[PDB]
């Protein structure tokens, strides 16, 4: 009742104020749809989206499959009044959940504030509303009334789980990128969610649930509202600017296509893939675009198309863009204030930050792709609440995110058919049949490796700089934390919103067309690779078995588990395979099962400590035979190979890191001035600290995108490998149990859910170790294989500045008579020592900092 003020029903009578048949900007002529105004500037249309796009009227599956991990198609969805009512209540509920958090409260306020700019006038001294930023509200009497708005929530198009921000474009202006902003139409459904898998939280939660977890749809909505946020303030990054990936190697993906805008919206490490140069380019770009709005507001003389005054309208956009105004009435953009507003919309309003506030399990990267799709019902309070989500307090579902777990909370999630086939998009990995014949496995596109292009990483480190006494000292960029979010919250003006002012009627049908959007080419599909050796993907495939009818499964230690469907590979000792494959009689069964649970824990809990490697203090030897690391199929060979060559042995590809010759400093001399001569020397020295900081940050960015992503995938694959082992073990134990007759009843009394629960527990404990080990390798690599490159490049820069400052001091020794000896020592001391590399300065991730 805080954000949404009325408790709406779909069958409520049309009134023409908050419940009315409306008409939106259209290519042709549309028929009115019943819509609901949940808040000021925010409307909801409980219909399938068939009107915004003239080419999207059909709700059937497209001729071509479409390149997404998970998709769902159902034309019958959102046709019944019951469905539309439940949609309206669902969307309303999620708005309340977003608002109930400190961060969501801020976001929703910023969205209402972000009224699209009145730049539809051809005469540059008049303020006129852009017609596509409005809707026509039809009254009970028959007449219509045009109204300004910021946001519209519509149901999905053909693909039900494809959520996105849409907006209508101008013929000449780029409204979402010029600072103006345009009305946002979000395609969303609260009746479906994504199924994902996570294993990173097991450190804090050892009793974590088994299978797939469900994405809280509030997070999803908040994600789309952030996209709307950027777009309303016209600060959205060009959809052209995509993160280009290498697609030629066998281990690489066939293609991904992720926009910078997407990585920015997520936050975490994902936002840090974008380097300092490109990020500064964007910040300075929208700084000048805001200044253009300030210029147009100073040239504005009269207002047209509304009863409201020019003085009021200028004030609205003053509040929106946080402009400073003189007593003379002139507007300007404050540098420090814009940065506060930009950082907020860019770095504070992120998906990862919302997770903090909701206290829910969620994907930690964008590259943690969805695996399934579930039908949900969040409207009943017994199922979902504004405060707790799925994870209801004082219930079984409170601890370890149990409410989000598909298997424990199975009555809340019904698994649906993924319309993307398991091998719709794939590479084909082949090997010599043991080339007269080949043995080939299909690997799904999203099980492959990222591998970003070098084109995505640009810098101006080579560019020289002229040091003066007036040289600006960059304030240390404070990293995102809850303390900072708290500070923005306290400075926030929550009361007072922009008003719903009466504007003059537009034409009966608003003529509008959606934003152009770049035409993205389809990836090459089904590429074949003929390989000399078995790969990681083969070893992972060998551990898989047909879930269905076929039973008799026998575990073994050779990768010819690929040949026989009854044979499944394992990396556990030969004693484990002998024990599990042993025929057992009813009398011996329970003691045989108890002993297998024991061995399963013992094989997986194996930890070998070391001090020889450095940076890496622990090792997990069975990762070698589990994934074929370095083509050395021995537990002894993995431990030995890791000590010898370090973390690089885990990597699928060696990242290229290009640091150029660092731009030297040039000094500006001032004759007969002792004060400003000392200032320039001091300015050059503290500007060197920024240079060390700049390089360090650049290396952290490359490591975060090229290396840490690889390790991220290996841990996910180890989680899969362990799950495969438990499944195979359960299948064999359950097969033996079903081979008995009537002695199953009382004599045994065996619970498979208990066996599954105990094995899941042992997997979690194994992952605790594995996560700890693989984090060390990622950082180990950063410290010994990536940072040194920058350091010796930086030490050569210190050499150039050393002689530059010593010659400078010498050349001005008549001006600095009494201080020459002192200044000579400071230059010699500070430029001889390296600046210590602190990981906590560039990486906020506190579980990466745990090393
Ligand atoms: Zn997105």
From Swiss-Prot:
Q: What practical use does it have?
A: Dynamin inhibitors slow toxin uptake by nerve cells, and might be used to prolong the treatment window for antitoxins.
The disulfide bonds in this chain are 430-440
The portions of this protein that span the membrane are 613-633, 642-662
Q: Is Metal-binding one of the keywords?
A: yes
Describe what happens upon changing residue 366 to A.
Light chain has 40% cleavage activity on SNAP25, 30% decrease in Zn(2+)
In the UniProt record, does the keyword Cytoplasm occur? no
Molecular functions per Gene Ontology: ganglioside GT1b binding; metalloendopeptidase activity; protein transmembrane transporter activity; toxin activity; zinc ion binding
What is the protein named? Botulinum neurotoxin type A
Q: What is the lineage of its organism?
A: Bacteria, Bacillati, Bacillota, Clostridia, Eubacteriales
Q: Which gene encodes it?
A: botA
Span of the entire protein shown here: 3 to 865 of 1296
């Amino acid at each position: 009742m805080e954000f949404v003020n009325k408790q709406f029903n779909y069958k409520d009578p049309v009134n023409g104020v908050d419940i009315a048949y409306i008409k939106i900007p259209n290519a042709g002529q549309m028929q009115p749809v019943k819509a609901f105004k949940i808040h000021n500037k925010i409307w909801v249309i409980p219909e399938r989206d068939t009107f915004t796009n003239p080419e999207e009227g059909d709700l059937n599956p497209p001729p071509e499959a479409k390149q997404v991990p998970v998709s769902y198609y159902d034309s019958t969805y959102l046709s019944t009044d019951n469905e539309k009512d439940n949609y309206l209540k669902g969307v309303t509920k999620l708005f309340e959940r977003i608002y109930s958090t400190d961060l969501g409260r801020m976001l929703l306020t910023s969205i209402v504030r972000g009224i699209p700019f009145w730049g539809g006038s051809t005469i540059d001294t008049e303020l006129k509303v852009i017609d596509t930023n409005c809707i026509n509200v039809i009254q009970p009497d028959g007449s219509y009334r045009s109204e300004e708005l910021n946001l519209v929530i519509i149901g999905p198009s053909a693909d039900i789980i494809q959520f996105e921000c849409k907006s209508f474009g101008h013929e000449v202006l780029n409204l979402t990128r010029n600072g103006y902003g345009s009305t946002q139409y979000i395609r969303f459904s609260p009746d479906f969610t994504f199924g994902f898998e996570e294993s990173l939280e097991v450190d804090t939660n050892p009793l974590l649930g088994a299978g797939k977890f469900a994405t809280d749809p509030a997070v999803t909505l908040a994600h789309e509202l952030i996209h709307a946020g950027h777009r309303l303030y016209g600060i959205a990054i060009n959809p052209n600017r995509v993160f280009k990936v290498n697609t030629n190697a066998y281990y690489e993906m066939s293609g991904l296509e992720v926009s910078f805008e997407e990585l920015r919206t997520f936050g975490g490490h994902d936002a840090k893939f974008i380097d300092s140069l490109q990020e500064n380019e964007f910040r300075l770009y929208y700084y000048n675009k805001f200044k253009d709005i300030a210029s147009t507001l100073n040239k504005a003389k009269s207002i047209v198309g509304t009863t409201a005054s020019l003085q009021y309208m200028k004030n609205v956009f003053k509040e929106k863009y946080l402009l400073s105004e003189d007593t003379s009435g002139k507007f300007s953009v404050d540098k420090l204030k814009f940065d506060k507003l930009y950082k907020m919309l860019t770095e504070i309003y992120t998906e990862d930050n919302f997770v903090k506030f909701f206290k829910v399990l969620n994907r930690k990267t964008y590259l943690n792709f969805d695996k399934a799709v579930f039908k949900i019902n969040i409207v009943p309070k017994v199922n979902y609440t504004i405060y707790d989500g799925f994870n209801l307090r004082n219930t079984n579902l409170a601890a370890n995110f149990n409410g989000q777990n598909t298997e424990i909370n199975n009555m809340n999630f019904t698994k649906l058919k993924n319309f993307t086939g398991l091998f719709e998009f794939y590479k084909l990995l082949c090997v010599d049949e043991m080339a007269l014949a080949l043995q080939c496995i299909k690997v799904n596109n999203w099980d492959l490796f990222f591998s970003p292009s070098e084109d995505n990483f640009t810098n101006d480190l080579n560019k020289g700089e002229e040091i003066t006494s007036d040289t600006n000292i960059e304030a240390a960029e404070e990293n995102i934390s809850l303390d900072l979010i708290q500070q923005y919250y306290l400075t926030f003006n929550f009361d007072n919103e922009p008003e719903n002012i009466s504007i003059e009627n537009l034409s009966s049908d608003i003529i509008g067309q959606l934003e152009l959007m770049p035409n993205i080419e389809r990836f090459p599909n089904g590429k074949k690779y003929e390989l000399d050796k078995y790969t990681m993907f083969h070893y992972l495939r060998a551990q898989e078995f047909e879930h269905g009818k076929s039973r008799i499964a026998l575990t073994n230690s050779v990768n010819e588990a690929l040949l026989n469907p009854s044979r499944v590979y394992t990396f556990f000792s030969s004693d484990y395979v002998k024990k599990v494959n042993k025929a057992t009689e009813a009398a011996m069964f329970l003691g045989w099962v108890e002993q297998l649970v024991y061995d399963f824990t013992d094989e997986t809990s194996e930890v070998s400590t070391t001090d020889k490697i450095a940076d890496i203090t622990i090792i997990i030897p069975y990762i070698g035979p589990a994934l074929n690391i370095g083509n050395m199929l021995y537990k002894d060979d993995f431990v030995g190979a890791l000590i010898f060559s370090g973390a690089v042995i885990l990597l699928e590809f060696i990242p290229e890191i290009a640091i150029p010759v660092l731009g030297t400093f040039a000094l500006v001399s001032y004759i007969a001035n002792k004060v400003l001569t000392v200032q320039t020397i001091d300015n050059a020295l503290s500007k060197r600290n920024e240079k060390w900081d700049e390089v360090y940050k650049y290396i952290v960015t490359n490591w975060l995108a090229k290396v840490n992503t690889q390790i991220d995938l290996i841990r996910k694959k180890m989680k899969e490998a362990l799950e495969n082992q438990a499944e195979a073990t359960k299948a064999i134990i359950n097969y033996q149990y079903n081979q008995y007759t009537e002695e199953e009843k009382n004599n045994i009394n065996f619970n498979i859910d208990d066996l599954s629960s105990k094995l899941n527990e042992s997997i979690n404990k194994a992952m605790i170790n594995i996560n700890k080990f693989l984090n060390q390798c990622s950082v180990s690599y950063l410290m010994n294989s990536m940072i040194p490159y920058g350091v010796k490049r930086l030490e050569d820069f210190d050499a150039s500045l050393k002689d530059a400052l010593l010659k400078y001091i010498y050349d001005n020794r008549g001006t600095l008579i009494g201080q020459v000896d002192r200044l000579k020592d400071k230059v010699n001391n500070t430029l001889s020592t390296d600046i210590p590399f602190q990981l906590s300065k560039y990486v906020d991730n506190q579980r990466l900092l745990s090393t």
